[PDB]
Amino acid sequence: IHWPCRLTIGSNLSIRIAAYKSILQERVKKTWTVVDAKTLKKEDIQKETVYCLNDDDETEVLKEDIIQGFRYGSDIVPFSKVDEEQMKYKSEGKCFSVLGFCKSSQVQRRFFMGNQVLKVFAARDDEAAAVALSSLIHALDDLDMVAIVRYAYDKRANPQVGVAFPHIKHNYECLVYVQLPFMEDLRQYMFSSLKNSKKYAPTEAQLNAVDALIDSMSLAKKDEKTDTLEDLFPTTKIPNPRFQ
Amino acid sequence: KYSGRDSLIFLVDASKAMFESQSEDELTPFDMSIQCIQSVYISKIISSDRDLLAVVFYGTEKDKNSVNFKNIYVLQELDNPGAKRILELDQFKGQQGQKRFQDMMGHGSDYSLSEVLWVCANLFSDVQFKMSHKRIMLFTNEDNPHGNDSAKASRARTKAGDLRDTGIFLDLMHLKKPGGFDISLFYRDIISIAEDEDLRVHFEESSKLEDLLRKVRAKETRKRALSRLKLKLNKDIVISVGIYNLVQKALKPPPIKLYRETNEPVKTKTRTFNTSTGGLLLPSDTKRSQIYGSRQIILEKEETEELKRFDDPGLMLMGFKPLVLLKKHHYLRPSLFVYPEESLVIGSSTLFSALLIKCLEKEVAALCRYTPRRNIPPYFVALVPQEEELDDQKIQVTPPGFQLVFLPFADDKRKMPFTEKIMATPEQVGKMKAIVEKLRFTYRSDSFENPVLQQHFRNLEALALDLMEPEQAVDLTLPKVEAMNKRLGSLVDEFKELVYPPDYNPEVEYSEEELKTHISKGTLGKFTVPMLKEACRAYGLKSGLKKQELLEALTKHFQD
Amino acid sequence: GVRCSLLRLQETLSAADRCGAALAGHQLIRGLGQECVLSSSPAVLALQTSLVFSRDFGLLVFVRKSLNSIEFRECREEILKFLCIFLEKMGQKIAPYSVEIKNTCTSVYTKDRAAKCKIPALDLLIKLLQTFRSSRLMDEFK
């Protein structure tokens, strides 16, 4: 589906844009409904959360007598639904602002997030903003460096940063958006080096054997010697076997 | 290691010169230290709310410690940080806070500097848990506590060395005061971190206290395996690896239901109640079901999990692919990390290291079938060999190993509409290049913070310490529109004139009779969905959401 | 066993800083119970119930008096380990004050959100160990 927005640099430079959805994990639409094994009817079944007090149970504790609460340290601070809605972050609707431009080497495929990828194509059929966007992506592609973006879906959705690589093909021309990690979103671990170790250093015979192994099980042949890596069994075209 | 919790003990001076300071707008060093300790508390309660923190004022007139020692006060003992512990500390901020401390604690009363260090070790030794780290910051505005008595200095040095031998690393965050002396002095052989520094004699500013980056209010530290799988090169030869995650989405802790009258947590009890005939139901008389049109498919609970089982949990290697065949566009899930582990299979690390070396030598990536749990459908993965990268400071930033890359299936790829290729020209691609070069940026991972999480944490702080107004987070992901516009210059308008055409702006009430007459009238038109819904609800007929549902049901039933 | 049980251990759940002295309570409950080996006229069968199970200063009620004590809910669990295996004496036909102890055990079941194999599976052996040695009075259990 169409997703209109406006990519803006500074304050007065704006290009009408349309980010179409791209590769995203897809699940099964239908759902499993619990049904009693006596007449095959859902109406007979009935489930409901029943909040119950802690001391010697109780008759009931009603919905209207329940308020939110957030753990903060060893104790609990009583928040509330209305207070959450009142005092919280408030953005300014959908936005695709550009923070800046960084070399296309400081972002790496490992530091990606999100369950989706976007392809910010152009504006609609009017070929006015398309020229500006194509100029931007060509300036990013013939040169190097890539555009960081502050992207937000709606007023309610949280704003996220990301990268917009140039992506030029013989049929179309557009950028692609993928989320980046935040500061709290990042985890650093400590691992022992696998090269300076002496116990697990493999000998020459093992190296040659595994070299022959990986040369035998190569999944790509340089057929016709035309500098084309003709592909053997590729995994990006097999349909998800789970659904079938 | 895993179950150890870091521990911290502060040590705030309370000398006479510690309180009195220069008479200007600059904070008195005591208020600076109290604010910094409060900031550390606030940072450490939101992040890793299991460490131990305690504060031990020294130089006071009173005394409170396990072993009776003069002029040493332990305001709090080692425990998890709490809101009440913060509120017990903010009463010392300001001149009124200074007077409160003076009337409640005192000042002067020359100390020994050794019994305080002994006391700190006492609380460190009184914990019944593990001790991952032991640190003691020494907030002080003086650098030569002694010198008129060499015996006290020697005793302090001996006790500090003993603490270092025990495994206690103290690091003083020196406070600067008017004058000219904060010299490297009888504290140099005491700093057991022994941080590298120029050690310049004539320091004239506050020491490494701004280094706190005060209130980094977002973190959740943890290291765990997350899986322990077998990598089957073939049917019979298998190696054992662990599947860590380097980057994972951060979410705010879930809310807890509370009873309004007593403000105590209420336990929930979800149970499938009777069939309007009384009683409770078995997991054995409630089968799962699905409906497609008029066909109802009835399927048991275990058979539901049986239809999504393909392989045993493990990585089945299926070949090697050149790195140039792994396109950047394709991406589904955050990339995981693989390290060789030697608990299930001995000798996995050697084969893993040989495979890594000869796989990044030939710039190829292992292709495997990934099944993380017992009943998950297989999902292909390209194991990209990630070579270890290290800084000059011997700090690991990209640990060696294999990195998962989830290759999407063809089901997970969406198709774009046809678009017309329109290319730019020279003389404006150059202008775009000039603008981009004028907007340089050295992107770093530690650049931005989640604004929603930051706002939520600040709101919680305001609601737990009655700050009378929440702290407004500076939204780091907001573009500096005015600064970047001023830096850009007038070339943006040259761009706009160059391509954009001059004319291009870039920017109830119803009853029986009316429905009986309307069904013959046949409109049910300006009749809104909100009022169709209320009619069908208050009348009691079955209702849905789509308009055609109600438009058919009411029409068929009301007349026929 | 010793009449000073009230003085020695009811003081424990009265003071602040409940982190600690749980081992002291464990020592107290081991001392009061090492005397259980004696079998010649214990004369404490009717004494314990009014002291360790009473609604005034009992110990099974020290779950309703332990709800707010999270730090003394697993320490309470560890002491009530032995407090609940204390019933391990199947050599008596006496059945005094068993009716209310049945629902007391039921309350212990419906009180603790954790230690589910430690507080439970440690209670409700009163059933099948102490109860169902019955059908002579049988007023409420079934």
Swiss-Prot record, chain A:
Entry protein name: X-ray repair cross-complementing protein 5
Signal peptide limits: none
Residues of the full protein shown: 245 to 488 of 732
Modification type N6-acetyllysine: residues: K21, K88
Gene: XRCC5
Coiled-coil residue windows: none
Organism expressing this protein natively: Homo sapiens
Processing after translation: ADP-ribosylated by PARP3.
Sequence positions bearing Phosphoserine: S11, S14, S74
Remaining remarks: Individuals with systemic lupus erythematosus (SLE) and related disorders produce extremely large amounts of autoantibodies to XRCC6 and XRCC5.
Domain Ku positions: 9-208
UniProtKB/Swiss-Prot annotation, chain B:
Phosphothreonine: modified positions: T425
SUPFAM superfamilies associated with the record: SAP domain, SPOC domain-like, vWA-like
Domain Ku, first and last residues per copy: 231-438
Mutagenesis or variant effect for K1A: Diminishes the ability to form a Schiff base. Abolishes adduct formation
EC number: 3.6.4.-, 4.2.99.-
Family designation: Belongs to the ku70 family.
Pfam families: Ku, Ku_C, Ku_N, SAP
Region ranges (Interaction with BAX): 529-534
Keyword Amino-acid biosynthesis among record annotations: no
Effect of K521R: Loss of methylation; loss of anti-apoptotic activity; no effect on XRCC5 stabilization
Family matches, as SMART domains: Ku78, SAP
The protein's assembly and partners: Forms a heterodimer with XRCC5/Ku80; heterodimerization stabilizes XRCC5 protein. Component of the core long-range non-homologous end joining (NHEJ) complex (also named DNA-PK complex) composed of PRKDC, LIG4, XRCC4, XRCC6/Ku70, XRCC5/Ku86 and NHEJ1/XLF. Additional component of the NHEJ complex includes PAXX. Following autophosphorylation, PRKDC dissociates from DNA, leading to formation of the short-range NHEJ complex, composed of LIG4, XRCC4, XRCC6/Ku70, XRCC5/Ku86 and NHEJ1/XLF. (Microbial infection) Interacts with human T-cell leukemia virus 1/HTLV-1 protein HBZ.
Record region (Interaction with XRCC5): 343-452
Cellular compartment(s): Nucleus; Chromosome; Cytoplasm
Name of the protein in its database record: X-ray repair cross-complementing protein 6
Inducing factors: In osteoblasts, by FGF2.
Organism: Homo sapiens
Function comment: Single-stranded DNA-dependent ATP-dependent helicase that plays a key role in DNA non-homologous end joining (NHEJ) by recruiting DNA-PK to DNA. Required for double-strand break repair and V(D)J recombination. Also has a role in chromosome translocation. Has a role in chromosome translocation. The DNA helicase II complex binds preferentially to fork-like ends of double-stranded DNA in a cell cycle-dependent manner. It works in the 3'-5' direction.
Primary subcellular site in the record, as a coarse category: nucleus
Superkingdom to which the source organism belongs: Eukaryota
Curated annotation (Swiss-Prot), chain C:
Location of N6-acetyllysine modifications: K111
Signal sequence interval, chain numbering: none
Processing after translation: Autophosphorylated at two clusters, the T2609 cluster and the S2056 cluster. Autophosphorylation induces a conformational change that leads to remodeling of the DNA-PK complex, requisite for efficient end processing and DNA repair.
Cellular localisation: Nucleus; Nucleus, Nucleolus; Cytoplasm, Cytosol
Highest rank taxon of the organism: Eukaryota
Role description: Serine/threonine-protein kinase that acts as a molecular sensor for DNA damage. Involved in DNA non-homologous end joining (NHEJ) required for double-strand break (DSB) repair and V(D)J recombination. Must be bound to DNA to express its catalytic properties. Promotes processing of hairpin DNA structures in V(D)J recombination by activation of the hairpin endonuclease artemis (DCLRE1C). Recruited by XRCC5 and XRCC6 to DNA ends and is required to (1) protect and align broken ends of DNA, thereby preventing their degradation, (2) and sequester the DSB for repair by NHEJ.
Disease the record associates with this protein: Immunodeficiency 26 with or without neurologic abnormalities: A form of severe combined immunodeficiency characterized by reduced or absent T and B cells, recurrent candidiasis, and lower respiratory tract infections. Some patients show dysmorphic features, severe growth failure, microcephaly, seizures, and impaired neurological functions.
Protein name in UniProt: DNA-dependent protein kinase catalytic subunit
Full protein stretch here: 7 to 148 of 4128
